[PDB]
Amino acid sequence: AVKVGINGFGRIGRNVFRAALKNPDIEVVAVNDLTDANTLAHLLKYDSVHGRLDAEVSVNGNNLVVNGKEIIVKAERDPENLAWGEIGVDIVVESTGRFTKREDAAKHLEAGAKKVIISAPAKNEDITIVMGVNQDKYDPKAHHVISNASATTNCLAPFAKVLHEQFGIVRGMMTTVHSYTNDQRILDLPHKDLRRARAAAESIIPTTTGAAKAVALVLPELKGKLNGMAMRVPTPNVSVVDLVAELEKEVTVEEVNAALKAAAEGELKGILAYSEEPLVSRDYNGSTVSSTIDALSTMVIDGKMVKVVSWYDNETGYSHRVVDLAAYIASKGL
Amino acid sequence: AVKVGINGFGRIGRNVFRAALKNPDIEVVAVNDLTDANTLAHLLKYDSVHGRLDAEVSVNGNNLVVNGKEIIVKAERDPENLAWGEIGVDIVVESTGRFTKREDAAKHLEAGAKKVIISAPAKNEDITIVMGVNQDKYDPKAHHVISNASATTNCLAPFAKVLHEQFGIVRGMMTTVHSYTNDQRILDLPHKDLRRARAAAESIIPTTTGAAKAVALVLPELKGKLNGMAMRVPTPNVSVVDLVAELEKEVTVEEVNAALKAAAEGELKGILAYSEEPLVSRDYNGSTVSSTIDALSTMVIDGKMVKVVSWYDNETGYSHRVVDLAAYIASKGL
Amino acid sequence: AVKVGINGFGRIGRNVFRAALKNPDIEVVAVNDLTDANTLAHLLKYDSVHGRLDAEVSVNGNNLVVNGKEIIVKAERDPENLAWGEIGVDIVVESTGRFTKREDAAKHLEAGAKKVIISAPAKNEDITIVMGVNQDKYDPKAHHVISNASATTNCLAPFAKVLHEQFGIVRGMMTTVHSYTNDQRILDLPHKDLRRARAAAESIIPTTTGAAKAVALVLPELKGKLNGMAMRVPTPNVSVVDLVAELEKEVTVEEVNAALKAAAEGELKGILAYSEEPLVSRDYNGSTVSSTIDALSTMVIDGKMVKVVSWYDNETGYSHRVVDLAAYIASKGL
Amino acid sequence: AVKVGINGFGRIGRNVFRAALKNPDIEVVAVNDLTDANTLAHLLKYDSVHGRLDAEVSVNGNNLVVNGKEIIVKAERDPENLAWGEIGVDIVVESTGRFTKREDAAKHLEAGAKKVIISAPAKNEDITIVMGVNQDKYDPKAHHVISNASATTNCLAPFAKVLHEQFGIVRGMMTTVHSYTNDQRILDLPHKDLRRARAAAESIIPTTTGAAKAVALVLPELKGKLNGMAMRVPTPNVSVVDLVAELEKEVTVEEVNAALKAAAEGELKGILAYSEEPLVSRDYNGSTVSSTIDALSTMVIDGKMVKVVSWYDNETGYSHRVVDLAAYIASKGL
Ligand SMILES: NC(=O)c1ccc[n+]([C@@H]2O[C@H](COP(=O)([O-])OP(=O)(O)OC[C@H]3O[C@@H](n4cnc5c(N)ncnc54)[C@H](O)[C@@H]3O)[C@@H](O)[C@H]2O)c1
Ligand SMILES: NC(=O)c1ccc[n+]([C@@H]2O[C@H](COP(=O)([O-])OP(=O)(O)OC[C@H]3O[C@@H](n4cnc5c(N)ncnc54)[C@H](O)[C@@H]3O)[C@@H](O)[C@H]2O)c1
Ligand SMILES: NC(=O)c1ccc[n+]([C@@H]2O[C@H](COP(=O)([O-])OP(=O)(O)OC[C@H]3O[C@@H](n4cnc5c(N)ncnc54)[C@H](O)[C@@H]3O)[C@@H](O)[C@H]2O)c1
Ligand SMILES: NC(=O)c1ccc[n+]([C@@H]2O[C@H](COP(=O)([O-])OP(=O)(O)OC[C@H]3O[C@@H](n4cnc5c(N)ncnc54)[C@H](O)[C@@H]3O)[C@@H](O)[C@H]2O)c1
């Protein structure tokens, strides 16, 4: 239905493409990176994390060919030269990781695009959205550069929403044991973050995260009530959020879990899931939801302090949300 | 000085041996396991985590020879047959992981030993000790089966003591992002804990930890106030404790860090350490302290909820504490 | 059609079960291990390597239930008490790793089974078979305890057969860069093989392998002409054989590759595959063939010496061959 | 004694710096990279692979301060702006990986340096040297841009030299199971080499190498007789060479090992080592020799074909050879 372009055909760019392949209302007509079609096709076909792409992939000139459909391949380092308008691209998924500033992402609009979805926390964006939490705040008239936040925020926000509405969150802190990403390093290389500069597959690497405070962007009532950190570990994909919060209402483990299960079946179905199985990260590789409560981990002290653990495939879940947001934004008229 | 025997020459047994080599007051004269001297000598000399042992290691008959001293090698799976008495062994380090219950650990006493140190949380032990927290409670007359707790409790207890004494802990929850251990599995094998049954180097594995509740054993005032869990990750060694606690007094990050640093350079020197550097797990491999505060991670919300993160080499640190405890127990008379 | 029993429901045991689910001619009616039905069910449903099993799995009493079919679960350490006869099991897949000697595997026969397939190299087996190479040598009247060799031998034999037949192998050496298995150790632990005793996910570990010499059992003309070793590395599954051989004829890379593809498309279709794609180990996870030639790696030096590289999913490919062998054996009369 | 500059303060650059701190004849007065002094100092102080540097490290403006010594820090992307001459730098270690072509490496000469050592195979270099094999071929008057070959070639050449002199090599093929390096990728990213584009810590990754070919550069008699490949695996450091060669005469494992042991204790002392211990990769971390024979792995088939396996710490060993070459080149006059 709506024509979409993807700038930065990497981990999120390609997984967003995989997700788009399952959404008939979304059509990816062009992608942009810093290599050639042959390379992007090879990477799209064979994935070290999600296996071979269950589709036909080939190349024809500067175009990828998936199931007969041709996708234009561009290699413009400067997004202002993408000429999105000429090929009718309305929504651009900005996932290079280099253009999170509005002034930069806005270059896509200058190139003829209508809307831009930054696949990460942004700066000076017109608004930040987390599907299932605040998409109703999207304004087609005033919002052109939208942030889909981070995978961590998309995992926490949904169940933070439930805990707050049902029991009221006074204050809380979280840690996300997160798999490594391409923003880290193989073997001790320069990095603005001296922790992320260290060999990713050899250590537990503490690093900051704005996910806790970013939750306030989608749930204003939580402003100043949350904070947290991250710990990158030697796993290629799938992460988990560990939240410890003080509640206004006195609760039991059963009550907390019941409320999370109810939200997973109702308001947040497809966004928040609920599991009573003793699973591990590998089990969630490929999961499309944004957050899956690990019910067995739920605990409470004095009926006022609770710990909630939730899984999330930082690649697949987030990419699906990006597509859901694309379709949602389009449904409001471009 | 004091004659020591080690039952279960594994990760702790061997690292305890390395630490013993550095203390003139403790002499390891015999070790017991389930293999021959050739095998134990090879494992002792070459370590995948701690490098080559800086000492001369050889074999005479079926006994070990380290720096000119002969170490008797036994291979009895039933501790009752160890005859520690015949060779003047007074203190036995029980580190097989199979004899944490008093009925099993006491067999060493039945066999001639005077004191037994269980290298883990125990059952029906005379007392559980964490050096730097409650070794003063040790009574040579009434205590014969002693537990040195777990590495996690040895990491948490030291700073929980500082936090409670200086600000007062109302309640709190912790999570330890822990390296995998020999209790886990290489590739999905049967295990009582269905999570620990899964490929250890492939996932983030949520599992239990008695550390939080065990802290009450050495700090009774914290009874019923703490709880937690563990996340086993793909690293071979070094772990980290993440504590989120509600304090009684209002505090600032600087006040919390100052108290921890004071204790680290004061009363808990050698046990608790304090670091303001942005380091990673590999950097703590070989660390001999029981707990190192990652000061850069300390945070506070509403001046009441605090997060404290502490590193610990679960093998080296704990092993050193086992030896310190042995020397301490010996100093009180056998 | 034929009722099959699996002794040792581990990596091979369970992956053989998966393969059997896709073969209407073989029905697994019972499995034996050292744990309960709940544990085996959990392990069968969630695999850290091959993902979630696409089938309904539940427990009923002390039995398993897969897609409405009930699978009997036993927990007999001694195979002689399995009572295969009483439940009509004619073929037993011996995959515990503890009964590779004929006298031990034969205990299944005393228990009522008619044929035993040892899922590994054996001792005193009536015959060793590699599907696609010598199944024609199987004699229903004289062969009751059959070995399906190792995964490495199943990978090498097929193309060693092609090379010898087309160009004649004078002599050769092979090395298999093999993923770790459950016969190794998580962290330096006693092991008859001092190399396999070392932390499996931490090093490149040289270890012996009888695959090269075993090829002689399925290809007699190669007796005394091949030898090799293995190198265990930090990967969970998928291995690769590296064969260097002196040939009788002088050849070119194109000639060698062409002959391998001819065999893959004809004589050994389904057993030997041919690939001209620049892939990596992850890409072969799930591959059901016994051997896939990495054509881009083929190399020839000074006309007479060649290097051929072939991939193989040591779990999936081998398990499918076990099932193919069971079906083949059954087609000859039980 | 001789003033040295390091271009590309990375894995080799920093480890070369470590080796130089041990050689009184080599004085590193400046290093160049693409970051700030604080970052380089931090990376030099804490190494994820080799541990904390045993020296005092601090920063003073644009200088590193190691044990009171001032080390100038530059950040010039273009080698021609380095002005080595102005600071008396005579020998430059080119270890960025971007200037292996003579035309590029020569830029250091234009900037005032007298000699350039390319820490890798090069293009149109004046000469390629492997200490212990052909340093005697270095000509101070004609050789200004020298290559110290690869770590792999430094491992193979020394023992290939012994085998050829003692038995005569007809032809041979090699494979080096190599730890991953910074030229690879964390998670499937564009790369000219489609194999190296794949997640490095997740697969066995075949990749080409001219190491066996480069041997002819230092041992001209082996021209056209060798070739090989590489296999990158999930280990951070330490690699191993696996050579299979056809000899001009029949030999036994004992004779091959005896000749290798003799050379390691004689002519190649310090370059070639010999071990009869059953070790693994982690055991060689820190090894300063270029090649250590794993005697237990030596094999021979049909009298004329041998397999020799040798270990090498690709970072430490090679870095030491770089320093050795610098001292050697200086001793010949600048
Ligand atoms: N990986 C995750 O788990 C995850 C989850 C949620 C959000 N994100 C966010 O998504 C963004 C991308 O992350 P990723 O993990 O996919 O990174 P990545 O490194 O895998 O992909 C980035 C891609 O963009 C390309 N690129 C870089 N500069 C370019 C330019 N100037 N023009 C065109 N293409 C260019 C790169 O070649 C690469 O293919 C980041 O902002 C990140 O924070 C990542
Ligand atoms: N690894 C850590 O981080 C850590 C830290 C603190 C405490 N611990 C505790 O220490 C104990 C041992 O742990 P580990 O990691 O050293 O385990 P391990 O598996 O590495 O070592 C156990 C050793 O005991 C031997 N053994 C087993 N049964 C025996 C028996 N019946 N008789 C004699 N020897 C026997 C084994 O062969 C092995 O060498 C456990 O109770 C564990 O919880 C572990
Ligand atoms: N894993 C591979 O890549 C591979 C490939 C080809 C062949 N094999 C061979 O297959 C065999 C099994 O290998 P694996 O990797 O599946 O091993 P594994 O350790 O994963 O499985 C062995 C199973 O047998 C069970 N067991 C042990 N003793 C038993 C007994 N006495 N009675 C009943 N059950 C028992 C264990 O609990 C476990 O579930 C070995 O002989 C091995 O050499 C392995
Ligand atoms: N790592 C090994 O095992 C090994 C062994 C022997 C030789 N080598 C070779 O040594 C070279 C470097 O390898 P490495 O592993 O140290 O790489 P690395 O990526 O760790 O280090 C390269 C360094 O150079 C810097 N750099 C890049 N371009 C630069 C420029 N234009 N100017 C100044 N600095 C620049 C990078 O910031 C980095 O610090 C390569 O040619 C490689 O093939 C590597």
From chain C, the residues in CB contact with D198 under 8 A are: 280, 282
B41 and B124: one domain?
yes
**Hey, is the C-beta of C186 within 8 angstroms of any chain B C-beta?**
yes
Across the interface, whether the CB atoms of C185 and B182 are under 8 A apart is answered yes
Helical pair C11-21 and C316-331, crossing angle rounded to 10 deg: 60
Å from CA of B299 to ligand 1 middle:
30
Q: Report the candidate in B6, A221, A281 with the shortest Cα–Cα distance to residue C48.
A: A281
Tell me whether residue C223 is exposed, middle or buried, using C-beta atoms within 10 angstroms of its C-beta: 0 to 12, 13 to 18, 19 or more.
exposed
Residue D199 sits at the vertex; the CA angle it makes with D195 and D201, to the nearest 5 degrees, is 115
Tell me whether residue C142 is exposed, middle or buried, using C-beta atoms within 10 angstroms of its C-beta: 0 to 12, 13 to 18, 19 or more.
exposed
Supply φ then ψ for residue A211, to 5 degrees: -55, -45
CA pseudo-torsion sign C263, C266, C269, C274: positive
B49 and B139: one domain?
yes
Which chains reach chain A with 3 or more Cβ–Cβ distances below 8 angstroms?
B, C, D
Across the interface, whether the CB atoms of B188 and C11 are under 8 A apart is answered yes
**Beta strands of chain A (E only): which ranges?**
2-7, 26-32, 57-60, 63-66, 69-74, 91-94, 115-118, 127-128, 145-147, 169-179, 205-208, 226-233, 239-247, 272-275, 291-294, 299-301, 305-312
Instruction: Give residues with Cβ within 8 angstroms of C80, minimum separation 6.
Output: C107, C110, C111
Q: Report resolution in angstroms.
A: 2.2
- Chain C segment 282-301 residues within 8 A of D by beta carbon are 282-283, 294, 296-297, 299, 301
Q: Report the candidate in A113, A117, A145 with the shortest Cα–Cα distance to residue A131.
A: A117
Q: Report the candidate in D62, D61, D110, D119 with the shortest Cα–Cα distance to residue D86.
A: D110
Across the interface, whether the CB atoms of A190 and D35 are under 8 A apart is answered yes
Q: Residue C288 and residue C272: Cα distance in Å, rounded?
A: 10
Q: Tell which one of C36, C43, C96 to mutate to probe ligand 3, the residue whose CB is within 8 A of the most ligand atoms.
A: C96
Q: Say how many residues make up chain A.
A: 334
**Hey, is the C-beta of C42 within 8 angstroms of any chain B C-beta?**
yes
Query: B128 with B122: CB under 8 angstroms?
Result: yes
Bridge partners, residue D299, by sequence: D307
Å from CA of B277 to ligand 4 middle:
26
Instruction: Give residues with Cβ within 8 angstroms of D285, minimum separation 6.
Output: B51, D49, D50, D237, D238, D313, D316
B127 and B27: one domain?
yes
Rounded to the nearest 10 degrees, how much is the dihedral formed by the CA atoms of A29, A32, A37, A38? -120
Query: C296 with C268: CB under 8 angstroms?
Result: no
**Hey, is the C-beta of D206 within 8 angstroms of any chain A C-beta?**
no
Across the interface, whether the CB atoms of C285 and A51 are under 8 A apart is answered yes
B129 and B256: one domain?
no
Residue-wise burial string across A309-319, b where 16 or more C-beta atoms lie within 10 A, e elsewhere:
bbbbbbbbbbb
Q: Residue B9 and residue B15: Cα distance in Å, rounded?
A: 9
> Closest-CA residue in chain A for B213?
A301
From chain B, the residues in CB contact with A297 under 8 A are: 206, 229
Task: Report CA-CA distances (Å) from A148 to A122, A132, B129, C92.
Answer: 9, 12, 50, 55
Query: D302 with C224: CB under 8 angstroms?
Result: yes
Tell me whether residue D156 is exposed, middle or buried, using C-beta atoms within 10 angstroms of its C-beta: 0 to 12, 13 to 18, 19 or more.
buried
The two structure tokens encoding residue D39: 């970052």
Nearest to C282 among A48, A280, A282 (CB): A48
> Closest-CA residue in chain D for C205?
D280
From chain A, the residues in CB contact with C279 under 8 A are: 46
Give the closest ligand to the alpha carbon of residue A48.
1
Q: For chain A, give percent helix, strand, coil, nearest 5.
A: 30, 30, 40
CA pseudo-torsion sign A297, A302, A303, A304: negative
Q: Residue B223 and residue B246: Cα distance in Å, rounded?
A: 15
DSSP B109-123: HHTT-SEEEESS--B
B191 and B296: one domain?
yes
Tell me whether residue B128 is exposed, middle or buried, using C-beta atoms within 10 angstroms of its C-beta: 0 to 12, 13 to 18, 19 or more.
buried
Atom 31 in ligand 1: residue holding the nearest Cα: A77
Query: C62 with C37: CB under 8 angstroms?
Result: yes
Task: Report CA-CA distances (Å) from A132 to A272, A294, B275.
Answer: 9, 19, 41
D6 lines ligand 4 (CB under 6 A): no
B35 and B76: one domain?
yes
User: What 3-state class would DSSP assign to B222?
Assistant: helix
Across the interface, whether the CB atoms of C52 and A283 are under 8 A apart is answered yes
Atom 34 in ligand 1: residue holding the nearest Cα: A33
Helical pair A316-331 and A151-167, crossing angle rounded to 10 deg: 70
Across the interface, whether the CB atoms of C177 and D204 are under 8 A apart is answered yes
The two structure tokens encoding residue A160: 């933070």
Q: Residue D229 and residue D193: Cα distance in Å, rounded?
A: 14
- Chain C segment 119-178 residues within 8 A of D by beta carbon are 170-173, 175, 177
Query: D304 with D249: CB under 8 angstroms?
Result: yes
B154 and B301: one domain?
yes
D33 lines ligand 4 (CB under 6 A): yes
Among D231, D238, D276, most C C-beta atoms within 10 A, so best to mutate, is D231
Instruction: Give residues with Cβ within 8 angstroms of B44, minimum separation 6.
Output: B9, B14, B17, B53, B57, B64, B66
From chain C, the residues in CB contact with A42 under 8 A are: 278
Nearest to B203 among A172, A204, A282 (CB): A282
Task: Report CA-CA distances (Å) from B126 to A107, B95, B145, B152, C334.
Answer: 71, 17, 5, 20, 64
B188 and B252: one domain?
yes
Number of domains in chain C: 2
Place of tokens 């709880």: B227
Rounded to the nearest 10 degrees, how much is the dihedral formed by the CA atoms of A188, A194, A195, A199? -10
Q: Report the candidate in A160, A153, A159 with the shortest Cα–Cα distance to residue A178.
A: A153
C299 and C178: one domain?
yes
CATH (domain of D117): 3.40.50.720
Query: D238 with D285: CB under 8 angstroms?
Result: yes
Nearest to A299 among B173, B225, B281 (CB): B173
B30 and B125: one domain?
yes
Q: Residue C199 and residue D234: Cα distance in Å, rounded?
A: 13
The two structure tokens encoding residue D83: 């002005």
Among D208, D244, D308, most C C-beta atoms within 10 A, so best to mutate, is D244
D156 and D277: one domain?
yes
Task: Report CA-CA distances (Å) from A258 to A164, D127, D327.
Answer: 14, 74, 72
The two structure tokens encoding residue B241: 């404790």
Bridge partners, residue D243, by sequence: D174, D308
Residue C124 sits at the vertex; the CA angle it makes with C120 and C130, to the nearest 5 degrees, is 40
Query: C164 with C246: CB under 8 angstroms?
Result: no
Bridge partners, residue D247, by sequence: D169
- CA C266 from chain centre, in angstroms, equals 22
CATH (domain of A241): 3.30.360.10
Supply φ then ψ for residue C247, to 5 degrees: -105, 160
CA pseudo-torsion sign B262, B263, B267, B273: negative
Across the interface, whether the CB atoms of D234 and C229 are under 8 A apart is answered no
**Hey, is the C-beta of C189 within 8 angstroms of any chain A C-beta?**
no
Nearest to C204 among D172, D235, D307 (CB): D235
Atom 19 in ligand 3: residue holding the nearest Cα: C182
Find the farthest-apart pair of alpha carbons in chain D and give their distance in angstroms, rounded.
65
User: What 3-state class would DSSP assign to A48?
Assistant: coil
| Residue B223 DSSP code | T
Instruction: Give residues with Cβ within 8 angstroms of B9, minimum separation 6.
Output: B17, B31, B32, B33, B40, B43, B44, B95
The two structure tokens encoding residue D167: 């038995």
The two structure tokens encoding residue A126: 């017109």
If one counts every other C-beta atom within 10 angstroms of the C-beta of residue C135, the result is: 18
Supply φ then ψ for residue A271, to 5 degrees: -105, -55
CA pseudo-torsion sign A211, A213, A217, A223: positive
User: What 3-state class would DSSP assign to B11?
Assistant: helix
- What domain range includes position A105? 1-149+315-334
- Give the CB-side neighbour count of residue B77, counting CA atoms within 13 A: 2
The two structure tokens encoding residue A186: 């193989």
Å from CA of B35 to ligand 1 middle:
52
The two structure tokens encoding residue A33: 């990176």
CA pseudo-torsion sign A34, A40, A44, A49: negative
D56 and D169: one domain?
no
The two structure tokens encoding residue B266: 């004061």
Across the interface, whether the CB atoms of B48 and C199 are under 8 A apart is answered yes
Q: Is C3 left (phi over 0), alpha (psi -120 to 50) or beta?
A: beta
The two structure tokens encoding residue B308: 């404290």
Q: Residue B305 and residue A171: Cα distance in Å, rounded?
A: 8
Instruction: Give residues with Cβ within 8 angstroms of A301, minimum separation 6.
Output: B171, B172, B173, B225, B226, B227
A9 lines ligand 1 (CB under 6 A): yes
Q: Report the candidate in A310, A307, A296 with the shortest Cα–Cα distance to residue A172.
A: A307
Between strands D63-66 and C305-312, the pairing is unpaired
Q: Solved by what technique?
A: X-ray
Return the amino acid letter for C258. Answer: A
Between strands C299-301 and C305-312, the pairing is antiparallel
Query: D57 with D65: CB under 8 angstroms?
Result: yes
